[model samples]
Target: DGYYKLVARHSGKALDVENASTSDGANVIQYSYSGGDNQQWRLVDLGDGYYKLVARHSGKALDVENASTSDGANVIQYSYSGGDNQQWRLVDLGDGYYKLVARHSGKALDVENASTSDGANVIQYSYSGGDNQQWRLVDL
Candidate 1:
């Protein structure tokens, strides 16, 4: 036997993703919001009640700046490096779309839904409060 699959349940909906180790690349394709260990992301309390998305499995966050659509683009573990993509700020938007702001870059994560590709990269463009890019932050 291996590991139990994690499932992400949102509004009664579920997304099944596979379990992965720190050595694996964070490919969202094989990666689904299944609420599994690999996909069960979290926000570590950085300080002052602030938190950041720390990939549970890898102990990292979904970065976009130092990250590129490469074969081994590492989703760096949470370090508070103050990098543009690593530095994120979440604001309540109500309706599951929390406005995420990147402190280093001062930008928002872009949404590329329906784009389930191998080299799909997350972009941090200007903020617009869109559903595709907006993410919901919850304690796992």
Candidate 2:
């Protein structure tokens, strides 16, 4: 099981827990490379092209907030329980990037409004093939 840092294509930042928080429901954000354990993740494949994204520091899975089906739902980290909201499909975009699609909502993991600010929310949005939704997983 290799660990990785999910780098957003648009911002070139890693997926990180806000302030390296270990609390459940900690906001997942896009931030400049900091080499923190909160930025490290492991993708646990569940077969059929789906997987669970587990945070290395907290052992929590990247989850859709409250299992919301609406666009712009916040993505947080929580203890894994095999919930569909915790399962994701990494769709290869064939350009050294992937679209992380939530299994339950079928939305793409996106950097909120293409924000460049540190701690900007990482939410789920309808797949639009936006660069903000594309990510490159770098082995850690």
Top-lDDT structure, candidate number: 2
Model 2: lDDT to the true structure: 0.92
- What is the C-alpha lDDT profile of model 2 across 26-113, one tens digit per residue? 9999999888999999999899999999888899989999999899999999989999999999999998999999999999999999
Best by TM-score: 2
- Compared with the true structure, model 2 gives a TM-score of 0.97
The TM-score values for the models, in the order shown, are 0.59, 0.97
**Over 4 Å off in model 2, which ranges?**
none
Local accuracy of candidate 1 as per-residue lDDT tens digits, 1-140: 12222121122221112235454334332234455565565655566434566555666555653644332233333344545556567666666556555655556554344244423334556666545455544444
lDDT of 1 at 124: 57
TM-score of 1: 0.59
- What's every prediction's RMSD, in angstroms? 6.6, 0.9
How many collisions per candidate? Answer: 9, 0
